[PDB]
C-alpha cells in the first residue's frame, strides 16, 4: 500500500494503518535500491555517510520490515530481517538517541530461539550484548527471557507459563512467539511426563499442561504414542531404540558376544 513518493513514507504509514499482508508488497522495490549502494550494512571504510542521507533512515526501514512479519506468523523471514538488524544498534558506538531504542524486538529473538529446544544459542546471544548489567539486567524486557528460562532450568513450568498469560506484552508483538513457545514448552514437558509419571489419569494431563479440552488432550497422546485406558494414561515408550544408525556402539544387539572378545584381542596387537 503506497502512500507518498518516498519508499520510507509508504512503508511507515501503511504499517500503522493495518493490512500487514499488503504492507509487505512494498518490500522488494526498497531492497533493490538499497543493495546497489550497499546501504543495508555499514561499511568498514569511511564513505562520509553515517548519521545522514538514507543510512539513518535505513535502520528504520528494516525495523518496520521485521515488525511486518511478526503479525503474519512467519519465523522464516523474521530470522532474515533480524540478521540485518544485528549490525544496527551495534555500530555508531552505543550512542545515537535512545541507543537500542525498542527493547521488545531484541527479546523476540531470544524467545523464538527457545521454540527449537536449543539451549546453547540462548545464552550465546546474551554474551553478544555490550552491557550485561546496564541495559540487559536493569530493563525487564531484556531480562524477560532470562527470568523465563530461569524457571525452565529450575524445572518449574507452571511459573514460566504464567509469564505468557498475566503479562500485558502478549497483545501485539509477543503474541506471535507466545503460542509457538508454549507449544515447545508443552512438548518439553511431555518428555518429562514419560519417565516421571508411570501412570497418570486423563484429568490431570489437562490441568498440568494447561489444556482447554479433554478430547484435545487425547489427540496429543496419539502423536506422542501414549497408550490410553479407562480414566488412566500409561507410558510404554520408556524403552528407546533406533536413533539414526549405530553399529558396534551404545548397547549393540548381536555383536555383544564378539566385541567382548574383540576388546581382548586389541590389547595384544598393541604390545606386538
Amino acid at each position: 500500500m503506497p502512500s507518498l513518493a518516498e519508499l520510507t513514507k509508504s512503508l511507515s504509514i501503511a504499517f500503522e494503518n493495518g493490512d500487514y499482508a499488503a504492507c509487505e508488497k512494498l518490500l522488494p522495490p526498497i531492497k533493490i535500491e538499497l543493495i546497489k549502494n550497499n546501504l543495508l550494512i555499514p561499511d568498514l571504510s569511511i564513505q562520509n555517510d553515517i548519521y545522514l542521507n538514507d543510512l539513518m533512515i535505513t535502520k528504520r526501514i528494516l525495523e518496520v520490515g521485521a515488525l511486518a512479519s511478526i503479525q503474519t506468523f512467519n519465523f522464516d523471514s523474521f530470522e532474515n530481517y533480524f540478521n540485518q538488524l544485528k549490525p544496527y544498534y551495534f555500530s555508531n558506538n552505543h550512542k545515537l538517541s535512545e541507543s537500542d531504542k525498542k527493547s521488545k524486538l531484541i527479546s523476540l529473538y531470544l524467545l523464538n530461539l527457545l521454540s527449537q529446544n536449543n539451549t546453547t544459542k540462548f545464552h550465546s546471544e546474551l554474551q553478544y550484548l555490550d552491557k550485561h548489567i546496564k541495559n540487559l539486567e536493569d530493563d525487564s524486557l531484556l531480562s524477560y527471557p532470562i527470568k523465563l528460562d530461569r524457571w525452565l532450568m529450575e524445572g518449574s513450568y507452571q511459573k514460566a507459563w504464567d509469564l505468557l498469560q498475566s503479562g500485558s506484552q502478549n497483545i501485539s508483538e509477543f503474541d506471535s512467539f507466545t503460542d509457538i513457545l508454549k507449544s515447545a514448552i508443552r512438548d518439553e514437558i511431555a518428555k518429562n511426563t514419560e519417565l516421571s509419571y508411570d501412570f497418570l489419569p486423563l484429568s490431570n494431563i489437562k490441568a498440568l499442561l494447561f489444556f482447554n479440552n479433554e478430547k484435545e488432550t487425547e489427540k496429543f497422546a496419539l502423536e506422542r504414542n501414549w497408550p490410553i485406558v479407562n480414566s488412566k494414561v500409561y507410558f510404554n515408550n520408556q524403552s528407546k531404540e533406533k536413533a539414526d544408525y549405530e553399529d558396534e556402539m551404545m548397547h549393540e544387539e548381536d555383536q555383544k558376544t564378539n566385541i567382548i572378545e574383540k576388546a581382548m584381542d586389541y590389547a595384544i596387537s598393541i604390545e606386538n
Partner: protein, 353 residues
C-alpha cells in the same frame, strides 16, 4: 633477505618488551606505528627458521589495554586498528600451508576466542573449533595450559561440562612458572571449580585452600553451602556481595545456571530413600521453595539424569529410587567397556616411551 629481516626484528623484540606493561609510549600513535612495522613482509614466504620471531606471546595483554578506556573509551563501535588486526590475523591463517605451523596457529585463535568472551557471540566460535584442532608439537608448556583454558571455557557457555572436563585437567598440571601459578592458576582453578558447579558435586576445600589466596576461597565456600543445603536466600545474598568478583571473571551467569543446580544438588543431599514420599513432606523440606514447585521440580530432574522417580497424583505421593542394584548379568558389563576405554588413554604410552 631472511638474515636482514631477522636482524632488524631482534632489535624490534627488545622494544616490544618495553611496549609490554613497561613503557606504553603514546596511546594513539603507537598502535598505528606498531602496525606498519609488521605487515610489510616480516612473515614473508616461510623460507627457513621462521617462528617465535613474530609478536606472538607479546601482544596478548597489549591490545586489550588500548581498546578499553584508552583509544576508544566507548567513543566508537570498535577499534579500527583491531578491525585491521582481525584482517591480518585471519589472513595469517589463510596463507598458512599447515606444514610446520604448530604454536603460531593456536595463539591467534586465542584472540578471536577471548574477544567473544567479553563482547561478541560465542556461537560462531564453535565453527573455528574444527579448524583450531591440530596436533601442535611446538606449543611451549606455558601456552599448553592456556590453549586448554579457552577450550574448557567455551564449552561452559555451551552447557557441556563433559567435553571441557578433559581439557581443564591438563591445564592445572602445566605452566610451572610462578606468574602462571599465581594469577593464571587462581583464575583457572575457579574455572575448574565452575565445572563442578554445573556437575553438582562441589567438593570441599583441601588442595585448593593453600594453592590460592583467600580472595577465591570466600565466594566458593558460600556457594558450596548454598547449593548443597538448597537455600536460594543465602545463594542470592552471595551474588550481591561478591558481584564485583563475578563480573571480571564473566562468572555472573551463575545466577541462572548454578541457581538451577541449587535445587538439583539438594535433591541428593536430602534423603529420598523411602519409596512413597508424601506431598506435604516435600513442601516442608528445602524451606518454602519446594512447596511451590513439587511435581514440575521432580519431573525435569529425572530426565536430566539426577535421580529416577515416579509421581502419583491419585494418593498424593512420589515413588523414588536411589539407584542401587546388584551385579548379575548386564549390570557389571556396563563398566566393563568403560574401564577398557579408561585404559585407552594409557595405551598411547607405548609410542611415547
Amino acid at each position: 633477505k631472511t638474515i636482514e629481516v631477522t636482524a632488524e626484528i631482534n632489535c624490534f623484540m627488545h622494544l616490544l618488551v618495553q611496549l609490554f606493561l613497561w613503557d606504553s609510549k603514546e596511546l594513539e600513535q603507537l598502535v598505528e606505528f606498531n602496525r606498519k612495522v609488521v605487515i610489510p613482509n616480516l612473515l614473508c614466504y616461510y623460507n627457513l627458521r621462521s617462528l617465535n620471531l613474530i609478536n606472538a606471546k607479546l601482544w596478548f595483554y597489549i591490545y586489550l589495554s588500548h581498546e578499553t578506556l584508552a583509544r576508544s573509551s566507548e567513543e566508537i563501535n570498535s577499534d579500527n586498528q583491531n578491525i585491521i588486526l582481525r584482517s591480518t590475523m585471519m589472513k595469517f591463517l589463510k596463507i598458512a600451508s599447515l606444514k610446520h605451523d604448530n604454536e603460531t596457529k593456536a595463539m591467534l585463535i586465542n584472540l578471536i576466542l577471548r574477544d567473544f568472551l567479553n563482547n561478541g557471540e560465542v556461537d560462531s566460535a564453535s565453527d573455528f573449533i574444527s579448524k583450531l584442532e591440530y596436533p601442535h608439537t611446538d606449543v611451549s608448556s606455558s601456552l599448553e595450559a592456556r590453549y586448554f583454558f579457552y577450550l574448557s571455557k567455551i564449552n561452559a557457555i555451551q552447557l557441556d561440562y563433559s567435553t571441557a572436563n578433559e581439557y581443564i585437567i591438563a591445564a592445572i598440571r602445566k605452566a610451572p612458572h610462578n606468574s602462571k601459578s599465581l594469577g593464571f592458576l587462581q583464575q583457572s582453578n575457579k574455572l575448574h571449580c565452575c565445572i563442578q558447579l554445573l556437575m553438582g558435586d562441589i567438593p570441599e576445600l583441601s588442595f585448593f585452600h593453600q594453592s590460592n589466596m583467600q580472595k577465591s576461597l570466600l565466594p566458593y565456600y558460600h556457594l558450596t553451602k548454598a547449593v548443597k543445603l538448597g537455600d536460594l536466600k543465602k545463594f542470592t545474598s552471595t551474588i550481591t556481595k561478591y558481584k564485583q568478583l563475578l563480573l571480571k571473571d564473566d562468572t555472573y551467569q551463575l545466577c541462572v545456571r548454578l541457581r538451577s543446580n541449587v535445587i538439583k544438588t539438594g535433591i541428593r543431599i536430602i534423603s529420598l530413600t523411602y519409596k512413597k514420599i508424601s506431598l506435604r513432606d516435600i513442601c516442608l523440606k528445602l524451606n518454602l521453595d519446594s512447596e511451590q514447585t513439587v511435581e514440575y521440580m521432580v519431573s525435569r530432574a529425572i530426565r536430566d539424569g539426577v535421580i529416577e522417580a515416579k509421581i502419583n497424583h491419585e494418593d498424593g505421593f512420589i515413588e523414588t529410587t536411589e539407584l542401587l542394584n546388584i551385579y548379575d548379568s548386564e549390570d557389571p558389563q556396563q563398566v566393563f567397556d568403560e574401564r577398557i576405554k579408561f585404559a585407552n588413554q594409557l595405551h598411547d604410552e607405548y609410542l611415547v616411551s
